[PDB]
Every structure is written in C-alpha cells, then in structure tokens.
C-alpha cells in the first residue's frame, strides 16, 4: 500500500465544479498515470459548454502523487503515503493584478482509480483582464514546487509562482499557496524541504468537437542540494 499502489499504470478521474465571477462550469478528465516514470496523460472536457476561463489557468488545479521519486527520497513522499485514504489539497491562486481562485480538492483512490475531485471559486476577476478576456496562450511553462512539512496539521505546504504566457509577450503570474492534509488519521511521511519539478504540454484532440484540453506531464522529485 502507499507507494505500492502506484507501481504500474493507474487510471485517473478528475472532476471539477467551478464558479468564476458567477460563471459556473464543470470539467471532467480521464487518463492515466505512471509514477515510476513520472508520466501523466489526461484529456479534459468542459461538460457544460464553453469554458469561461482559459484552459491553462486550470492546469495546476486539475495529482502530485504521480511524481517520480528517486529511491532514497521515497520515504519523504507525503502524497503516496497518504494513500489510499487520500489527502485534501487546498490552494489560493492569486493572479497578479487580477482575481483569485480558491480551490478545495480531495485526492484518493476509488478502487483502481486515482480520483481528484475539486471545487473552485474564482472572485474579483476583471471583465477584460487576461483571464475572463481569454488573453493567455495555449501553452505551459515548467515549474518547481517547493514542499515543506507542516507537522501541526500533519501535512505539507507549498508556495510557487506559475508563469502564464500572454498573447502580447507578457507573463501573467499566478501565485500559488497550497496546503495538503491527510484524510486518514495515521502518520504519514513528511518531506525534508524537497521540490517537485513539472513540465507540461497542452494539445488538442483533432476528432474532439467539445471544448477540451489534452495534457501530457512529466513530474519528478528532487532534493535541494543548495539554493
Ligand atoms: Mg454540470
Ligand atoms: Mg484556453
Ligand atoms: Mg505546451
Ligand atoms: Mg488541506
């Protein structure tokens, strides 16, 4: 159990219910994860019609348990150790000079499937800013996510800044503050100030008529040799 549950290719299910400035929407995703290789392959669909925000702004919200960990650090993998009961993942995403997403998700196994279920509330967005104005490019940069223990709630925190490319060559910053807490009541592995590195590629299914996002991710864990 724990890391043993990720030994092969694991089916994934993602469900997001969103409300941004009162615009409600839903997203459903399906695909597979291979933690041994740090590989994720997912396809997301907006089931309610058109997405009212850019797909990229939802990437980080839409399963860090799939990171590839080198064998010595595996005893610091909070995310797999909390499995299969899972963890709660909460974020405040503050878009620079624009609005804020508040997210609460539960990540856990439902049988053989790793499930990420999310509620997202977005507030204070500008009607013709980069988000509601859809001025973000359909691409994604690579980011490191620095993970620190928070042994008071028996979990981890992370702070990181996502850089979204804007169609005019500027970069829309999305400041992320993240908290994860186990759902189960037992002890879990806590990290020694490590980081997760992620790389993402966004594309489109040519046969798909619905508003959608195909996503391929690498994700790997690594210790901080120095700053
Ligand atoms: Mg719906
Ligand atoms: Mg988009
Ligand atoms: Mg890309
Ligand atoms: Mg939490």
Swiss-Prot record:
Effect of residue 44 to L: In mut3.3; shifts fluorescence lifetime from 3.03 to 1.88 ns. In R10-3; matures to the red-emitting state with excitation and emission maxima at 555 and 585 nm, respectively
Outcome (variant: residue 123 to V): In EBFP2.0; shifts the excitation and emission spectra to shorter wavelengths and increases quantum yields compared to BFP
Source species, domain of life: Eukaryota
GO biological process: bioluminescence; generation of precursor metabolites and energy
Consequence of substituting residue 145 to I: In Azurite; shifts the excitation and emission spectra to shorter wavelengths and increases quantum yields compared to BFP
Effect listed in the UniProt record for changing residue 198 to Y: Gives rise to yellow-emission variants. In EYFP; leads to yellow fluorescence, folds faster and more efficiently at 37 degrees Celsius and has superior solubility and brightness
Outcome recorded upon mutating residue 198 to H/W/F: Results in significantly red-shifted excitation and emission maxima
Tissue specificity statement from the Swiss-Prot or TrEMBL entry: Photocytes.
Resulting phenotype, residue 144 to K: Increases fluorescence at warmer temperatures such as 37 degrees Celsius. In Esmerald; leads to brighter fluorescence. In VisGreen; leads to brighter fluorescence
Post-translational modification remark: Contains a chromophore consisting of modified amino acid residues. Maturation of the chromophore requires nothing other than molecular oxygen.
Assigned keywords, A-Z: Chromophore, Luminescence, Photoprotein
Mutagenesis or variant effect for residue 188 to A: In mut1.5; shifts fluorescence lifetime from 3.03 to 2.72 ns
Annotated effect of mutating residue 162 to T: In P11; increases fluorescence at 475 nm excitation and at warmer temperatures such as 37 degrees Celsius. In Esmerald; leads to brighter fluorescence. In VisGreen; leads to brighter fluorescence
Effect of residue 63 to L: In EYFP; leads to yellow fluorescence, folds faster and more efficiently at 37 degrees Celsius and has superior solubility and brightness
Disulfides per UniProt: none
Biotech applications: Green fluorescent protein has been engineered to produce a vast number of variously colored mutants, fusion proteins, and biosensors. Further generation of mutants led to more stable proteins (at 37 degrees Celsius for example) with brighter fluorescence and longer fluorescence lifetimes.
Result of altering residue 157 to Q: In R10-3; matures to the red-emitting state with excitation and emission maxima at 555 and 585 nm, respectively
Effect ascribed to mutating residue 74 to R: In Topaz; shifts the major emission and exitation peak up to 20 nm
Subunit structure: Monomer.
Annotated family: Belongs to the GFP family.
The protein's role, per its UniProt record: Energy-transfer acceptor. Its role is to transduce the blue chemiluminescence of the protein aequorin into green fluorescent light by energy transfer. Fluoresces in vivo upon receiving energy from the Ca(2+)-activated photoprotein aequorin.
Protein name: Green fluorescent protein
């Amino acid at each position: 159990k724990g890391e043993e549950l990720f030994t092969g290719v694991v089916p994934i299910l993602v469900e997001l219910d969103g409300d941004v400035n009162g615009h409600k929407f839903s997203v459903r995703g399906e695909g597979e994860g291979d933690a041994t290789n740090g590989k994720l392959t997912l396809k997301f669909i907006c089931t309610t019609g058109k997405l009212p925000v850019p797909w990229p702004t939802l990437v980080t919200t839409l399963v860090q348990c799939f990171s590839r960990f080198p064998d010595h650090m595996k005893r610091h993998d909070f995310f797999k150790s909390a499995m299969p009961e899972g963890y709660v993942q909460e974020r405040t995403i503050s878009f620079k000079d624009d609005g804020t997403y508040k997210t609460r998700a539960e990540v856990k196994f439902e049988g053989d499937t790793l499930v990420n279920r999310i509620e997202l509330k977005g507030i204070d967005f500008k009607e013709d800013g980069n988000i509601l104005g859809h001025k973000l490019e359909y691409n994604f940069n690579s980011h490191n996510v620095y993970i620190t223990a928070d042994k008071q709630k028996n979990g981890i925190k992370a702070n990181f800044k996502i850089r979204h490319n804007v169609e005019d060559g500027s970069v829309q910053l999305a400041d992320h503050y993240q908290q994860n807490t186990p759902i189960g009541d037992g002890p879990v592995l806590l990290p020694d100030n490590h980081y997760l590195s992620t790389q993402s590629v966004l594309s489109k299914d040519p046969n798909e008529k619905r508003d959608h996002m195909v996503l391929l991710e690498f994700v790997t864990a690594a210790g901080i040799t120095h700053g």
